[PDB]
């Protein structure tokens, strides 16, 4: 029931809102995505 | 008695006013929603 | 799945290492526990 | 390589050197482990 | 013919983009919806 | 019920007093008319 | 006296001037309302 | 269903963890308490 | 030699960079797209 | 029936009332014309 | 100008400000209390 | 193709309507001209 | 002499410093590039 | 009296506050416990 | 295997997202690249 | 038994071994003394 | 009575707490393990 | 000749002086080793 | 199989070799004695 | 296979040369002896 995390490699530009990062991360065969707090990076998550 | 919390997967845009976040969170099968103070993100809530 | 988060009420002192906060969260009928990055608060996580 | 990350559940104490974190992460069925640069936390990794 | 407008009753929060305001007005049995320039309210429009 | 609003397409000049604007709006098949507060435009109102 | 506060759940748009927010808050069975300083939210107030 | 909110009158110092603020708020005849995110104030909550 | 404008009805989220808004506007059978200045709305353009 | 918009290029002066802008826009082979809210520019509209 | 010092055994949480520690220390039948500078421990004091 | 922009060299005064700014830009051997949304600067455009 | 400017259509990520934006713009057949102040966009420039 | 010390073999994690180390040390049939200054080791003491 | 590290020679500016650093590092005959946490340097990696 | 602590008033010089510090503390109406770890200060102890 | 020591071949990383060093040394068919005071290495001891 | 770096995985304890770390690195098929400045980690180096 | 530790109260001077400190600790009703590493104090040990 | 080490209990005086310490160590049922580099203590070694 762990949540593994890695940075998106297909997300363009600044990560401001969640649905775009979640959509790109799901496209990368992950389950969810969210933005980082400081550098606005789109992080992909999936169970592991 | 204890409120659990997670970020909304469907809420678009910046979380400014509460009602739009509560509506998106209730649609996601939660009991309420609210914005984060700093990053302005829609956080869904439900009893743990 | 979705991960829900809430602050623990039994963890004493500052949260430095994860196992102690994880232990108190499992004691609080949760799945995992981790420390916050700035104020070092013990946060309990579990499926929503 | 692209690596998924999650914090070690079993690693005790401050993460200073890599081998102790790697040892706990491998025991948790992960490929490797490393210390976070700032907060000094043992993060487990596996290919993604 | 002429276009009559009135404030929406189901649109929550601040009117930023048009599709959300336009969708609520159609559910309110109007033909179109647009955001007010200043106060950012959802104005529903239909033929008079 | 709700009040639908549209500008007058027959009122000439500045909208200073109410009776002339109401009189023009009733001729335009509306129930009432009033002046806008800043630009002094004659506005016609009727039930939606 | 001690005043309790909550954000309005009926106020549409951004909060520029006080009277529109005060009106919505009073319809919500509060005694007054005012605009937040930065994000221009409508905050309702009433004695606790 | 409305959560009224006001700052605690008995909580001393800065609000870091929830239990100390919730404890002081219940002693003030409120149902819960939490820390403000930025100013770290202790805010008491009860149904309006 | 004039350009017709309308807001996108398929663009997701906030318009920061141009290429994403141009791509969504082309899918809506326009020729180009650009962001609004403040509210960051994706505006579609095409020859009138 | 999406509405495409462009600024008038024959309207002289400042757009206060709608009839002058609508008449100028129809002479420009558009279906309607309305004033902008702040700068009072005449804006022509027609189906996209 | 001497004070006998011992660590508090009732102070919960992090010791950032003086008031919370001094409050818990007086309840422990001491006269004052202050926080340690690094680990943020509550230290009670009383005249020797 | 791609459109490059630069502020006009000859346009006198504040840029409110488009036709005046378009004339000055064409006189400067550019294609079109438009106003900036904030400082109201006349911006000339031509293919990059 | 006169500097013509457009936004890059190839620059990936946040524009914090100049050299990364300058390198992308030269590949785009421009001569220089700089970052926007607020949203940190890469803007390419070249002589008109 | 004469006081002897030995490192605790049951205290988990980092020794921050005294009560956890004291409780673990008394569990080991000792009389008191405190933390070392630098490495934060839980040291158990008892009459020797 | 183990990963050797060295700072990229061709990476301009600071390292924000991974794909830019990975691309420059691969062109320098390395297998991967990532950003340093604090100084935001592009560090090229290859098996060792 | 709870132990109170303060630095000696009369201990001459740098605290290295225990007996000299204990002697000065017993003279100062305390029960025992010991050296601090870093600055090597003689610290007197007695029950609170 | 007499005791001989040697460096541990199994203990990884820095030697902070005694139990992990004793556990590795017992696994190396020694009777006890402890950390060297300075270089913080795990030393294995057994009857000599 | 560009040099590559990897943290040692056999060096015991903290890294105070170079020779002990350099010796462990050569046994790891590297050419040299040195201590990190703050956390005193043994870092192995060899030509890339 | 657990050694308790206390500083000698009879050994004079600095502790260089083991036999002298060991002898002084035997007279103090202890099993063994050894020097501290840096300050060269005589430490007496006996089973807990 | 492994060299176990302990301090000699028969060597008198300073340890300047190896042969004198080796002779005393061999007399103590050991294989070899050597001087410590700073304190000049005679240390006996033998297979573990
Ligand atoms: C200096 C006092 C304040 C504490 C600094 C803490 C640094 C920190 O939080 O690093 C993480 C942050 C990147 O965040 P993100 O990539 O997860 O969005 O950091 C960065 O992006 C790195 C740059 C940090 C600022 C420059 C170095 C001092
Ligand atoms: C002008 C300074 C005024 C005082 C600032 C101090 C406020 C404060 O305590 O912030 C801590 C907050 C929550 O911390 P934690 O519970 O996650 O450890 O964590 C954060 O604020 C970080 C999360 C937000 C990330 C975006 C920061 C730009
Ligand atoms: C020929 C000169 C034209 C400009 C001078 C008058 C400005 C103006 O048009 O204000 C009125 C207009 C809407 O008013 P109305 O059409 O409802 O009467 O728009 C507004 O109410 C704009 C409000 C401006 C303040 C915004 C910040 C709170
Ligand atoms: C000590 C006096 C107060 C200053 C420190 C407290 C920070 C603070 O009040 O943040 C401002 C703002 C709050 O919005 P509002 O709901 O109060 O209108 O919310 C935000 O900041 C939202 C995030 C974006 C940052 C501001 C952008 C303009
Ligand atoms: C006095 C200096 C002001 C400088 C900025 C001027 C305001 C401005 O240009 O607002 C643009 C925005 C329209 O959104 P957009 O679709 O054009 O991005 O319009 C609005 O958001 C209208 C409501 C603005 C309310 C502001 C309240 C503080
Ligand atoms: C250097 C600072 C300059 C600030 C004033 C900017 C003036 C300006 O361009 O306002 C016009 C803009 C849109 O007007 P319009 O083309 O719809 O008539 O209006 C809007 O976008 C709506 C908001 C206007 C009022 C803003 C009050 C904060
Ligand atoms: C590898 C293990 C890392 C452990 C990290 C935590 C150590 C630490 O914070 O020690 C604090 C201690 C006293 O702190 P306090 O309780 O007075 O706030 O220290 C001092 O007051 C002395 C200052 C530091 C002197 C020694 C430097 C290592
Ligand atoms: C190639 C660089 C382009 C600008 C980079 C980002 C900063 C910015 O937006 O400044 C300009 C902007 C005016 O917008 P516009 O009317 O020029 O489109 O903002 C203002 O008008 C505010 C600043 C100027 C007035 C300051 C008054 C204290
Ligand atoms: C604290 C936040 C201030 C900016 C609010 C709007 C946020 C936003 O998306 O601004 C983008 C826009 C263009 O800036 P840039 O992305 O080109 O650097 O920026 C502007 O046009 C800003 C103009 C501000 C003029 C103010 C004059 C009083
Ligand atoms: C480069 C500086 C080297 C300092 C260490 C050498 C001296 C040493 O180890 O002294 C023993 C001390 C034990 O402290 P404690 O057991 O009383 O908490 O342990 C420490 O003080 C260990 C601190 C080492 C921490 C280094 C960063 C991880
Ligand atoms: C920075 C200016 C010089 C140091 C001033 C003293 C700072 C201070 O109050 O440190 C006290 C603290 C605890 O020492 P002790 O009472 O446990 O021996 O920890 C220490 O004494 C650790 C610091 C030792 C190293 C001093 C600077 C080289
Ligand atoms: C003056 C102390 C704070 C600044 C230390 C120097 C800044 C720095 O390089 O931080 C990163 C550094 C990495 O250690 P190393 O692997 O390079 O030895 O080490 C750390 O991140 C460890 C932080 C040390 C303080 C820990 C809390 C007491
Ligand atoms: C930066 C990390 C390391 C800082 C010092 C850590 C504490 C430390 O090593 O204390 C023990 C040592 C003497 O101990 P001992 O010989 O009495 O057992 O030393 C002292 O008593 C400390 C006195 C200060 C001078 C130490 C010189 C090596
Ligand atoms: C205030 C007292 C300062 C130290 C004075 C005493 C030094 C001392 O006794 O050094 C020898 C001893 C180990 O010696 P030996 O048993 O290997 O011959 O211990 C050491 O080698 C410890 C070296 C000191 C720390 C060096 C920096 C980490």
Author numbering:
A (entry chain I), B (entry chain K), C (entry chain L), D (entry chain J), E (entry chain F), F (entry chain E), ...: 0 to 47
Paper text:
Defensins are among the largest and best characterized family of cationic antimicrobial peptides (CAPs) that are produced by essentially all plant and animal species as an important component of their innate immune systems. These small (<60 amino acids), cationic, and cysteine-rich peptides can be expressed constitutively or inducibly, and exhibit broad antimicrobial activity. A key function of defensins during innate defense is their ability to permeabilize and disrupt cell membranes. Recently we demonstrated that the ability of certain plant defensins to kill fungal and tumor cells is dependent on the engagement of specific membrane phospholipids, which trigger the formation of large defensin–phospholipid oligomers.
To address this, we determined the crystal structure of a NaD1–PA complex to 2.5 Å. The structure reveals a near-flat, carpet-like oligomeric complex, which we termed the ‘membrane disruption complex’ (MDC), where a monolayer of NaD1 molecules engages PA molecules on a single side of the complex, thus mimicking the manner in which NaD1 would encounter PA molecules of target membranes. The ten dimers are arranged in a configuration that results in the formation of a mildly curved, carpet-like structure which we refer to as the membrane disruption complex (MDC), with two such 20-mers forming a large 40-meric ellipsoid complex with a total of 28 PA molecules. The MDC comprises three small arcs comprising three or four NaD1 dimers, respectively, in a 3–4–3-dimer configuration. All 14 PA binding sites identified in the MDC are identical, and are formed by residues from the signature SKILRR motif in the β2–β3 loop of NaD132. A single PA molecule makes contact with Ser35, Ile37, Leu38, and Arg40 from one NaD1 dimer, which enable Lys36 and Arg39 from a neighboring dimer to form hydrogen bonds with the phosphate head group via three water molecules that are conserved throughout the 14 PA binding sites. Intriguingly, assembly of the MDC from its constituent 3-dimer and 4-dimer arcs is achieved almost exclusively via hydrophobic interactions where Ile13 and Ile15 from the β1-α1 loop of NaD1 form continuous hydrophobic interfaces along the sides of each arc. Structure-guided mutagenesis reveals Arg39 as a key residue for the cooperative PA-mediated oligomerization and fungal growth inhibition. In contrast to wild-type NaD1 and NaD1(K36E), the NaD1(R39A) mutant lost the ability to form oligomers with PA, while still maintaining PIP2-mediated oligomerization. Since the MDC exhibits a slight curvature, we speculate that the formation of this complex is likely to induce curvature stress that would be expected to weaken the integrity of the target membrane.
